[PDB]
Ligand binder design. Structure first.
Ligand code: CLA
Ligand code: CLA
Ligand code: CLA
Ligand code: CLA
Ligand code: CLA
Ligand code: CLA
Ligand code: CLA
Ligand code: CLA
Ligand SMILES: CC1=C(/C=C/C(C)=C/C=C/C(C)=C\C=C\C=C(C)\C=C\C=C(C)\C=C\C2=C(C)CCCC2(C)C)C(C)(C)CCC1
Ligand SMILES: CC1=C(C/C=C(\C)CCC[C@H](C)CCC[C@@H](C)CCCC(C)C)C(=O)c2ccccc2C1=O
Lengths: 728, 166, 115, 42, 165
């Protein structure tokens, strides 16, 4: 059972004894979604972790590749041994029509396309070592998808499954903490100490190749790790009662990073992952469940009130319990920066060994790992909508904290709207000046460093203090919490540089105030269209068109782009303008003014100049010297292996392009068309009967969105790439 | 709007139509299957078994050279062209007999009965004498090589571990 | 399924394997020794836990071919309630552990018993 | 089987499926006569 | 099946020009001996004559051809035609075109015209299989042998494509 289609599915009028093409993207454009399904949870809870399923079975279906296509054709071994010079590679490609050169031949006895995004650095991190090995983990995870995808069939199918004990929400919110983080954090420590720590500490010089202490060892009998960082390993662990001090040895807050190749200490990662490990094991019991220990579920929240902000933040929802949509913004804005947090974090202060020096992933990664984040949040609260126009039922609220906003609309939104001039309008309206003041504007006097200076300065800030922080003040840890901040206490390694005191100033309270801007007029778009969305002060009654819903009146003299669905249809564009900015600022700091090389007489030598400082003030400086000063990489870059990035943003510029045709265009104009041609088929009897109508409005504010928004990405990943590697 | 409701089998839910499955095979001429599956490897019921013998060729193996004609890359890869065109027209229009002619859309009788139906012990004659043979070309199934790049099934062989050791 | 139904058998089931790891002696593994006298091993000479296939096939389906229906019999042949049993599920788990988690067959004493 | 027939279809991946499991052949041919450059008649 | 008594003659015409077509190069056909891709012409000749190229045997003998073929065409169209061998009937007794000028728009039927033996017809097409042997070799392998007890079914040699030509 059951099933199967055939016409008709969920958009009530789907079958319609057809009549027209353009159903094949009403279905492709409903299909998952609900209410154009039902909130009748006893068949919607039993979809969401159905799921939620595959995505993993897909993620598995994923990862089970990225080792088979690691460990079926290494650069891993044929390099590992030697970090430094000779670097990444996970795909080599069949000899069709001139594929070949696409698999380079530049990796240590290996033909193949070079690889950006750790992995080598992720698996020289644990240890593993041997292709026949995480190939012995390619199979570990592929059926291992199977059973998890054998859960679709587990419940639901032969088992219409349970909302009764889905709705509740206490065991799970306790157990994730404990339960299935806590199987983790520390039960990666047993791994991160015994497996990981020393097959690294003893990697950290000798141990070149093949005799590689297959993890097999170091259980039941110690002696060796014992022969290494001691601990006295009899059959009696001190710190059972406070000999803690001893079984330490190899985990005092070391901070800085491994100067015998960057990363930063694994001697500095069990103390991090058994503390933040168990908070999440203990603190993952604080709520009800059965055995009388716990807290309010919500009974906590209405705990407290405040006069204005009244009731307080009270009686916190009951679909927040129930289902998704209501909830569904928060697990995203959150998860949101929880991919901008780990970002501005990773590069920011290196994990797995071989980053700091690297590039083509102390950048690369950095991004995507900021797309997904931007993407994610900058489309998280299109879930605040739906919801109101959807999953929100009759009542639960008034005097709720909620409503306290919906009243106080118009004059909450509003007072952002102005910042969103000042902050920007004039703070971007500010490179502009120094263009009108470098072209027209004679260094004589204007906004750059030896200019609208700002002498010492800008500080430092703090950071710096971040550099008196370990020598006292938070007593120790070691070496200045992250070299990036501090004073001049300066390292690197691998000839080229690693991280250093990356000093800010003008060029720094500039730019910034743009991310500082943007993420203003990129929210409120958002908030304007998140608040009004269902009640809009100017079609006042929305829940009368749906979630998407095009516009409405040619009347009231120009009502369009009203929907949040379409408040989201440009909710994005900017993100792209904002995530697909910010990346940028990054990749001309890391580089030009962070990456290095080495020579010697006191002199680090960057990929490009300490340019930047005063040739990325002026708006322009980013085409003078951020394009045609770069791109050279990709511009020429054919007959080679940059031979894809000379091949992508091509058909990435077109397909930034072939957006506007559907996005600047009309819609009636097009339908109006698909007759004309029609005469050819018909009169000459061919013609459909799925009357070939021309793509539905929303549907084409559902392409010049994707397409624009596929377009100027790859492009910049067709681009930013090939810069890095040879002048990389 | 039939029926549909009914439509089907005519409803639903929730069961035994039954015809039934789905989830395997198979309704119409799941007999083309039948009629194809016997022959195809009844054919094969005579390729490897001759082979599974020859190793044992008591006193002399075989011998035959030619006595035909001998020159410049002479004889047998030409070839199937003639050999399996002949047995080409063999396969085809014996077994357009799942029914068969167009039910899908001189004389008459012979034989007497209904494919001289049956007889009702000879239905059993065909039985698993037909099927058990394709139980035994499951031996085939499981390689049908035994030469598993296997060396190996020589020095001929085949088998034969029992299983000696030392 | 079942639930609840799949404990009694689990009961009887592990019981024998648990019974293996107590009334034993033992004698291989090996590991540590030597892993792999009677004839030598008589034991076929090497690799023969695939009678299990047939055998561990021959009991469970032969149990359930049951089910009272039992067919599997056949024509002829002449060619707090999870609280109780499920705490009982634990204390039988357990004394696999100490009966394994050190050697039993100690045989350390005390005295002597044969000798 | 039949008869033209008709016969029986299937769903959304047929015009698609055509791309792969058959259309590829192309790359075999394009291998077989490596590239084309222009007309090889026989 | 296929279609209606549309072309018969067209292909018949074709089969007429056919046998004696494959009779043409059927001189290279070698009584015993005299073949190859051709140049000459029956026997003799020796007038003044039948010549090249400010002359060509072409346009002379094959302008006038036109009225010799248009007569038939307009003969078909407006029947027109003997009494009546080729369009169509008198003797004896071929494969019947059978129909008369129109249908239900087209189908009050359409093809119950089979029946018989080996018969008349056949050879008409024989020469186009001849052809699709006889053309194919002659630039691929430009001579025609047949040779038993020697080395038929043995061969000898090899010869493929790209050599060069
Ligand atoms: C389109 C597909 C389908 C798929 C593949 C997913 C996939 C996902 N959903 Mg999800 N969801 C779906 C339909 C789906 N959802 C529906 C129909 C609803 C109701 C509107 C929700 C409401 C929902 C909520 C509230 C959340 C998710 C979350 C997630 C993520 C959790 C990952 C996981 O399960 O563990 C690993 C595999 C995952 C990407 C969570 C998340 O934050 O991730 C984005 C959580 O926020 N979903
Ligand atoms: C985060 C956890 C992690 C995990 C999963 C393990 C797991 C293990 N450790 Mg272990 N260990 C760890 C962190 C971990 N350790 C750390 C941080 C240290 C330094 C103190 C040790 C020092 C250590 C020693 C010295 C030994 C183990 C041993 C063991 C093993 C057997 C213990 C036993 O038989 O129970 C017995 C229970 C008792 C209460 C005693 C077991 C695989 C033992 C071993 O290798 O053989 C048995 C060995 O005794 N560990
Ligand atoms: C020994 C101590 C320490 C302490 C003081 C607690 C205390 C608690 N745990 Mg807990 N827990 C611990 C270690 C601890 N845990 C460890 C190491 C694990 C992983 C093995 C867990 C896994 C765990 C789970 C899954 C649950 C608790 C729960 C609880 C609470 C219910 C009572 C209970 O005994 O649960 C069981 C604890 C055992 C150690 C058994 C209680 C506050 C329950 C809860 O969160 O609901 C309020 C929940 O059932 N714990
Ligand atoms: C502009 C870029 C930014 C940057 C610098 C990167 C960079 C990267 N991404 Mg990424 N990504 C981004 C935005 C970015 N991404 C966004 C917005 C998404 C959501 C659509 C993704 C979804 C994504 C996935 C699923 C993957 C990556 C992966 C990667 C890594 C390989 C590049 C790749 O997969 O493309 C090229 C991929 C192709 C299939 C092109 C071939 C065309 C074929 C199908 C014909 C590389 C670090 C790969 C990874 O993590 O594995 C280690 C993984 O493949 N990304
Ligand atoms: C928790 C996360 C994740 C998950 C599981 C979902 C799940 C869902 N989203 Mg969603 N979404 C997400 C993140 C997620 N979204 C983000 C980050 C954004 C901002 C870009 C959106 C913006 C969004 C919109 C605008 C809509 C949805 C809709 C939906 C629902 C139907 C989508 C669908 O398959 O239609 C089928 C459509 C396609 C397959 C076309 C997409 C193009 C393909 C080819 C890629 C489904 C419940 C729809 C909905 O809720 O119905 C009213 C719709 O309104 N989402
Ligand atoms: C001199 C310099 C110049 C040329 C400007 C010019 C401007 N400022 Mg301004 N400003 C300046 C220094 C300057 N400021 C300083 C030193 C501060 C405090 C550090 C501010 C704090 C400020 C605020 C809060 C606002 C402006 C705004 C504006 C704009 C006024 C409204 C408008 O023109 O549209 C205008 C572009 C306003 C704006 O952007 O929108 C009204 C906004 O109200 N400025
Ligand atoms: C290159 C730029 C061009 C320029 C000069 C602007 C300038 C502006 N846009 Mg804008 N915009 C553009 C292209 C541009 N946009 C495009 C292509 C889109 C679609 C992606 C948008 C979508 C957009 C939105 C949604 C909003 C703006 C807003 C604004 C104003 C913010 C205040 C300011 O900085 O004023 C200096 C001049 C500003 C006028 C915002 C605004 O005015 O807030 C209420 C906001 O509504 N824009
Ligand atoms: C004659 C011109 C021509 C045209 C019409 C274009 C057009 C474009 N280029 Mg492009 N380019 C050109 C020549 C051209 N380029 C040349 C000669 C080079 C160097 C050889 C480049 C190097 C280049 C790169 C590296 C990129 C583009 C991108 C783009 C697209 C920007 C998409 C967007 O919305 O973000 C524009 C939004 C911005 C905020 C840009 C900020 C730029 C300054 C102020 C800093 C757009 C299609 C990009 C893209 O699609 O993603 C961003 C990016 O990938 N181009
Ligand atoms: C006619 C014809 C044709 C043609 C074609 C063409 C010519 C095309 C081109 C087009 C163009 C002119 C352009 C386009 C391009 C493409 C692209 C562009 C794709 C994409 C993508 C993707 C899937 C990606 C993703 C990503 C991520 C992950 C994130 C970051 C970035 C990136 C992008 C990497 C065909 C063959 C079909 C068929 C037959 C005939
Ligand atoms: C072009 C255009 C259309 C018409 C576009 C349509 C109908 C999309 C065409 C759909 C696909 C491509 C069908 C074409 C045929 C394909 C399915 C496959 C055949 C081609 C080969 C791959 C074999 C709109 O509807 C529209 C609406 C609103 C604003 C702008 C526009 C707009 O610009």
């Amino acid at each position: 059972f059951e099933q199967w289609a055939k016409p008709g599915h969920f958009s009530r009028t789907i079958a319609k004894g057809p009549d027209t093409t353009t159903w094949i993207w009403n279905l492709h454009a409903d299909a998952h979604d609900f209410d154009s399904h039902t909130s009748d949870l006893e068949e919607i809870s039993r979809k969401v972790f159905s799921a939620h399923f595959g995505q993993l079975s897909i993620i598995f279906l994923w990862l089970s590749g990225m080792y088979f296509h690691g460990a079926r054709f290494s650069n891993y071994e044929a390099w590992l041994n030697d970090p430094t010079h000779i670097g990444p590679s996970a795909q080599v490609v069949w000899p069709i029509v001139g594929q070949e050169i696409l698999n380079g031949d530049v990796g240590g006895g290996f033909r193949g396309i070079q690889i950006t995004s750790g992995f080598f650095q992720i698996w020289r991190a644990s240890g593993i070592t041997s292709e026949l090995q995480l190939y012995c983990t390619a199979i570990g995870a592929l059926v291992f998808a199977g059973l998890m995808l054998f859960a679709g069939w587990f419940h639901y199918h032969k088992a219409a499954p349970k909302l009764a004990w889905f709705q509740d929400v206490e065991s799970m919110l306790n157990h994730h903490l404990a339960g299935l983080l806590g199987l983790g954090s520390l039960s990666w420590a047993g791994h991160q100490v015994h497996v990981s720590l020393p097959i690294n500490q003893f990697l950290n010089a000798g141990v070149d190749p093949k005799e590689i202490p297959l993890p097999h060892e170091f259980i039941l009998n110690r002696d060796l790790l014992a022969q290494l960082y001691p601990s006295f390993a009899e059959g009696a662990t001190p710190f059972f009662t406070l000999n803690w001090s001893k079984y330490a040895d190899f985990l005092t807050f070391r901070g800085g990073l491994d100067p015998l190749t960057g990363g930063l200490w694994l001697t500095d990662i069990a103390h991090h992952h058994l503390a933040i490990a168990i908070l999440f094991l203990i603190a993952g019991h604080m709520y009800r469940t059965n055995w009388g220990i716990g807290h309010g579920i919500k009974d906590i929240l209405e705990a407290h009130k405040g006069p204005f902000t009244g009731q307080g933040h009270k009686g916190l929802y009951e679909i927040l319990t129930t289902s998704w949509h209501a909830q569904l913004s928060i697990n995203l804005a959150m998860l949101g920066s929880l991919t901008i947090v780990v970002a501005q974090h990773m590069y920011s202060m290196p994990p797995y060994p071989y980053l700091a020096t690297d590039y083509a992933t102390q950048l690369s990664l950095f991004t995507h790992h900021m797309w997904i984040g931007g993407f994610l949040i900058v489309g998280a609260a299109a879930h605040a909508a739906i919801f109101m126009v959807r999953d929100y039922d009759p009542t639960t609220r008034y005097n709720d904290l909620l409503d306290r906003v919906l009243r106080h609309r118009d004059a909450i939104i509003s007072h952002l709207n102005w910042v969103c001039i000042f902050l920007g309008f004039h703070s971007f309206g500010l490179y502009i000046h120094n263009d009108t003041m470098s072209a027209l504007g004679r260094p004589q006097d204007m906004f750059s460093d030896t200019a609208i200076q700002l002498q010492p300065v800008f500080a430092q800030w703090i950071q710096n203090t971040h550099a008196l922080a370990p020598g006292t003040t938070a007593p120790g840890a070691t070496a200045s919490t992250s070299l990036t901040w501090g004073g001049g206490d300066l390292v690197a390694v691998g000839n080229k540089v690693a991280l250093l005191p990356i000093p800010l100033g003008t060029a720094d309270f500039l730019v910034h105030h743009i991310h500082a801007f943007t993420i203003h007029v990129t929210v409120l778009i958002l908030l304007k269209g998140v608040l009004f969305a269902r009640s809009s002060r100017l079609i006042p009654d929305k829940a009368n068109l749906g979630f998407r819903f095009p516009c409405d009146g040619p009347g009231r003299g120009g009502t369009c782009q009203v929907s949040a669905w379409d408040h989201v249809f440009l909710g994005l564009f900017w993100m792209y303008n904002s995530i697909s900015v910010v990346i940028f600022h990054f990749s001309w700091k890391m580089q030009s003014d962070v990456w290095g090389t080495i020579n010697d007489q006191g002199v680090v030598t960057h990929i490009t100049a300490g340019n930047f400082a005063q040739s990325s003030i002026t708006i322009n400086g980013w085409l003078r010297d951020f394009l045609w000063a770069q791109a050279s990489q990709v511009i020429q870059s054919y007959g080679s292996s940059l031979s894809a990035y000379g091949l992508f943003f091509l058909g990435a510029h077109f397909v930034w392009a072939f957006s506007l045709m559907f996005l600047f265009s009309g819609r009636g104009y097009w339908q109006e068309l698909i007759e004309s041609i029609v005469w050819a088929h018909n009169k000459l009897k061919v013609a459909p009967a799925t009357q070939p109508r021309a793509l539905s409005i929303v549907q084409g504010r559902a392409v010049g969105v994707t397409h624009y928004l596929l377009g100027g990405i790859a492009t910049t990943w067709a681009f930013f790439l090939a810069r890095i590697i040879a002048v990389g | 709007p039939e029926w549909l409701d009914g439509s089907l089998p005519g409803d639903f839910g929730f069961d035994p139509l039954g015809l039934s499955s789905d989830p395997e095979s198979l309704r119409w001429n799941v007999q083309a299957e039948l009629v194809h599956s016997r022959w195809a490897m009844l054919g094969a019921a005579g390729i490897f078994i001759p082979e599974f013998l020859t190793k044992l060729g008591i006193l002399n193996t075989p011998s035959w050279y030619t006595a035909g004609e001998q020159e410049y890359f002479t004889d047998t890869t030409t070839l199937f062209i003639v050999e399996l065109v002949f047995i080409g027209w063999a396969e085809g229009r014996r077994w357009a007999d799942i029914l068969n002619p167009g039910c899908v859309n001189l004389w008459f009788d012979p034989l007497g009965w209904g494919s001289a139906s049956p007889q009702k012990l000879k239905e059993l004659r065909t039985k698993e004498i037909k099927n058990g043979r394709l139980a035994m070309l499951a031996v085939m199934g499981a390689w049908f090589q035994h030469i598993y790049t296997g060396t190996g099934p020589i020095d001929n062989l085949f088998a034969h571990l029992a299983d000696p050791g030392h | 399924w079942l639930a609840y139904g799949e404990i009694i058998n689990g009961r009887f089931a592990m019981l024998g394997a648990a019974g293996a790891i107590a009334p034993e002696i033992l004698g291989k593994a090996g590991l540590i020794p030597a892993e792999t006298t009677y004839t030598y091993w008589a034991d076929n000479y090497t690799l023969f836990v695939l009678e299990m296939a047939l055998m561990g096939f021959a009991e469970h389906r032969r149990l359930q071919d049951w089910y009272n229906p039992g067919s599997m019999g056949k024509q002829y042949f002449l060619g707090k309630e999870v609280k109780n049993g499920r705490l009982a599920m634990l204390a039988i788990l357990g004394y696999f552990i100490q009966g394994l988690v050190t050697g039993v067959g100690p045989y350390q004493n005390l005295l002597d018993h044969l000798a | 089987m039949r008869d033209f027939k008709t016969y029986l279809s299937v769903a959304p991946v047929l015009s698609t499926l055509w791309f792969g499991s058959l259309a590829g052949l192309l790359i075999e041919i394009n291998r077989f006569f490596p590239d084309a450059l222009t007309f090889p008649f026989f | 099946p296929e279609n209606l008594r549309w072309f018969v003659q067209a292909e018949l015409v074709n089969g007429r020009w056919a046998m004696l077509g494959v009779a043409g190069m059927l001189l290279p056909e070698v009584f015993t001996s005299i073949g190859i891709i051709n140049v000459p012409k029956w026997y003799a000749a020796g007038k003044e004559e039948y010549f090249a190229s400010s002359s060509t045997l072409f346009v002379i003998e094959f302008i006038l051809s036109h009225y010799v073929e248009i007569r038939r065409w307009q003969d078909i169209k407006n029947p027109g035609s003997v009494n009546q061998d080729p369009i169509f009937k008198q003797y004896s007794l071929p494969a019947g075109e059978v129909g008369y000028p129109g249908g239900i728009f087209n189908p009050l039927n359409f093809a119950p015209t089979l029946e018989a033996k080996e018969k008349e017809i056949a050879n008409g097409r024989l020469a186009m299989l001849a052809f699709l042997g006889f053309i194919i070799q002659h630039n691929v392998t430009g001579k025609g042998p047949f040779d038993n007890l020697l080395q038929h079914i043995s061969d000898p040699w090899h010869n493929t494509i790209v050599q060069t030509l």
